[PDB]
Structures are given as C-alpha cells and as structure tokens.
C-alpha cells in the first residue's frame, strides 16, 4: 500500500512530463512550419530585387550613353554653325563683289 | 527517491524551453510582418526600376537619333563647302 | 521481467533529459538569430525606402 | 489474497503504461530535435538570402547616385 502510493505519484508526474513535452514538440513543429512558409516569401523578395537591380544597372548605362551622344551632337551643332558662318562669308563675299 | 528529483529537474527544463519557444514564435510572428512588408517594396521597386529602365532607354535613342541627324547635315554642308572650294581652285 | 522494465524506462528517460538539454540550447540560438534577421529586415526596408524615393524622383525628372 | 492481487495487478499495469509513455516521450523529443535543426538550417539559408538582398539596395544606391550625376548633365 506504501509502494503503490509512491508509484501513483511517479506515474502521475511522468505523464505531467509527457503532456508538457508534446507541448514543446508543437512549439518546434510549428516553428519549422512558419520558417518554411516564410521561405518562399523570401524567394520573391530576392527575385524582385535581383530584377530591380538588373533594371537599374541597365538603365544607368543608357543614361551614360545618352550624355555621350548628346555631347557628340553638341560638337556637331557647332561645326555646322562654323560652316554656315563660312557660307555666309562666301555669299557675302560675292554679293560684296558687285 | 532520486526518481522524483529527476522529474522535478526534467520538468523544470521543459517548462523553460517552452517559455523560450513562446517568445521565439513572437519573434517569428514579427518576422512575418517585417518580411511581408518587404515583399511589397521589393515588387514596388522592380516595377519602378523597370519603368525608369524604359525611360532611360528612351533618352539614349533620343540622343543617338539627335546625333545622327547632325552628322548627316554636317555631311551635306561639308560636301557643299567642298564643291565650292573645288570649282574656284580647279583652274 | 519488471525490475529491468524500470531500469530501462529510467535509462531512456535519461536520454529525454539530455536531448531536452539540446532543445533549450537550440531555442536560444534560434532566437538570437531571428533577433538579428528582424534587425536586418528593419534596416533593409529603410534602405529600400530611400531607393523608391530615389527612383520615384529620378523617374519623374525624365518627363 | 485477491485483495492484494488486484492491487498488485493494477500496479504492474502502471509499470508498462509508464515505460510506454517513456518510449513515446523519447520519440516526441527526437522529432523536436530534427524539426528544430531543420528550422535552424533554413534560417541559415534565408540568412544569406537577406544578405544578398542587402547587397542589392547597396548596389542600387550607388547606381542611382550615378544616374543622378548623369541626368544633371542633361539639364
Ligand atoms: N551604344 C549602343 C548601345 O548601347 N546599344 C545599341 C543596341 O544594341 N541597340 C539595339 C537596337 O537598335 O534595337
Ligand atoms: N551615331 C554614330 C554613327 O556614326 N552611327 C550610328 C551607329 O552606327 N550607331 C551604332 C553603335 O553605336 O553601335
């Protein structure tokens, strides 16, 4: 009757342990679940950013070119005027000769 | 007899690890919000980058075109100056 | 027998104890890590706020 | 001695029931360890993903700072 009273006490608590372990099991199971669920949401973030970076990288070089061509066309606009000043001088050099 | 301290120990451990995981889910639960908000700015950026992308490709073609016309016009006008420089020098 | 039955359920109950030792250890890292990843995302969203302002502004200056 | 027989039959009953829940515990804890490591490894892989995503904003920032310089040379 004594040995039984000390067993019903162990058995009682050994289960208090189990039921508290399942609780810890789910804490660990639901953990791996949420982290796997967020894992794909990260793939899209990474995706959209590695694209956003690609786009900007392309877009930035274009601008660099745009300024180059502009600076080219700017030089030519000057050459042209110079030539027209030369033609006006020619035209005025004939009308200026009767 | 030690078969009761073992339970008072092991159960002590467990409670502690569970007290920890409650917190750990609160940290993951925030990582879901912090993470979900960044998925939005990631998409709301690849879009504006794809837009500024096109707006950059446009300015490029615009000045390549603008440049082309100049060389042509220079071509003709320089041909003219050439013609003249030749007729009044070819005997 | 049953005297070994106890001796066995105590010998593996011993393991339970130790593995739970690991679990705590792990849950502490699993936390200190998410404490850094939630720190990162908080920062990344700031940099990525600076860059949407950097792009919305430049993209409207091309017009 | 049936009085003590049914009091020691339900005592060898508590014996197995306890070693059985000790078998079960051992498992739940084993899985909790696996499931725990999986979680830790994932955060490690996703840890790098975020590492990359941050390099991203850095790159983008340095570039947008350049495309800034350029569009200034375009009035
Ligand atoms: N500098 C010239 C350049 O950056 N790209 C020229 C090109 O590939 N153009 C494509 C097209 O003409 O459609
Ligand atoms: N505008 C420079 C020129 O002389 N021709 C235009 C051209 O061929 N563009 C193509 C390129 O730059 O690759």
Catalogue all structural domains in chain B, each as residue range(s) with its CATH number: 1-91 (1.20.5.110)
Query: What does this entry list as its resolution, in Å?
Result: 3.4
Domain ranges in chain C are 1-63
What is the SS3 assignment for C9? helix
Residues 6+ apart with CB under 8 A from A65: B60, B63, B64
Name the token pair of B67. 């440049």
First to last CA, chain C: 89
The answer to whether the Cβ–Cβ distance between D22 and C50 falls below 8 Å is: no
Method by which the model was determined: X-ray
A80: closest CA of chain C, how far (Å): 28
Of C31, C37, C52, the CB nearest to B48: C52
Query: How far is the CA of D37 from the CAs of A28, D27, D30, D43, in angstroms?
Result: 9, 15, 11, 10
Name the token pair of B74. 């220079």
Question: What's the domain count of chain A?
Answer: 1
The DSSP code for D75 is -
> How far does Cα A6 stand from its chain's mean position?
65
Burial tier of B54 (Cβ tally within 10 Å: 0-12, 13-18, 19+): middle
Query: How far is the CA of D39 from the CAs of A39, A42, D32, in angstroms?
Result: 11, 15, 10
Nearest CA in chain D to C16: D26
Domain ranges in chain D are 1-75
A84: closest CA of chain C, how far (Å): 33
Closest atom of ligand 2 relative to the B68 alpha carbon: 1
Using CA atoms, how far apart are residues D12 and C32, in angstroms rounded to an integer?
46
* Region for B90 from its dihedrals, namely left if φ exceeds 0, alpha if ψ lies in -120 to 50, beta otherwise: beta
Using CA atoms, how far apart are residues C2 and D13, in angstroms rounded to an integer?
11
Range D1-75 classified under CATH 1.20.5.110: yes
Residues 18-77 in A contacting D (C-alpha not used; CB under 8 Å): 18, 21-22, 24-25, 27-29, 31-32, 35-36, 38-39, 42-43, 45-46, 49-50, 52-53, 56-57, 59-60, 63-64, 66-67, 70
DSSP-based helix, strand, coil % in chain D, nearest 5: 95, 0, 5
Domain extent, residue A48, equals 1-98
Of C13, C37, C48, the CB nearest to D57: C48
CB C9 within 8 A of CB D18: yes
Which of D25, D44, D49 to probe by mutation at the A interface, max A CB count within 10 Å? Answer: D25
CATH dotted code for C1-63: 1.20.5.110
Output the residue whose Cα is nearest ligand 2's atom 13: B64
Domain CATH code at residue A30: 1.20.5.110
Closest CA to D43 of C41, A22, B56, A16: C41
């Amino acid at each position: 009757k004594q040995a039984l009273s000390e067993i019903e006490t162990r058995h009682s608590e050994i289960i208090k342990l189990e039921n508290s372990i399942r609780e810890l099991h789910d804490m660990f199971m639901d953990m791996a679940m949420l982290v796997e669920s967020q894992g794909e949401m990260i793939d899209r973030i990474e995706y959209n950013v590695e694209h956003a970076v690609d786009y900007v990288e392309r877009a930035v070089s274009d601008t660099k070119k745009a300024v180059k061509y502009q600076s080219k066309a700017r030089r030519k606009k000057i050459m042209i005027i110079i030539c027209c000043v030369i033609l006006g001088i020619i035209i005025a050099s004939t009308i200026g000769g009767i | 007899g030690s078969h009761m301290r073992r339970l008072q120990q092991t159960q002590a451990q467990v409670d502690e690890v569970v007290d920890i995981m409650r917190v750990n889910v609160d940290k993951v639960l925030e990582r879901d919000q912090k993470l979900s908000e960044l998925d939005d700015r990631a998409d709301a950026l690849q879009a504006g980058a794809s837009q500024f992308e096109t707006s950059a490709a446009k300015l490029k073609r615009k000045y390549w075109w603008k440049n082309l016309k100049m060389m042509i016009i220079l071509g003709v006008i320089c041909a003219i100056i050439l013609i003249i420089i030749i007729v009044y020098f070819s005997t | 027998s049953h005297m070994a039955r106890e001796n066995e359920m105590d010998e593996n109950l011993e393991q339970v104890s130790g593995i739970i030792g690991n679990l705590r250890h792990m849950a502490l890292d699993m936390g200190n890590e998410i404490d850094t990843q939630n720190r990162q995302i908080d920062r990344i969203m700031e940099k990525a706020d600076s860059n949407k302002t950097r792009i919305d502004e430049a993209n409207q200056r091309a017009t | 001695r049936n009085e003590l027989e049914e009091m020691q039959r339900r005592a060898d009953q508590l014996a197995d029931e306890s070693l059985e829940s000790t078998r079960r515990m051992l498992q739940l804890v084993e899985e909790s360890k696996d499931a725990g490591i999986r979680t830790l490894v994932m955060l490690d892989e996703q840890g790098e993903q975020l590492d990359r995503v941050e390099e991203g904003m850095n790159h983008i920032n340095q570039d947008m700072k350049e495309a800034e310089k350029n569009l200034k040379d375009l009035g």
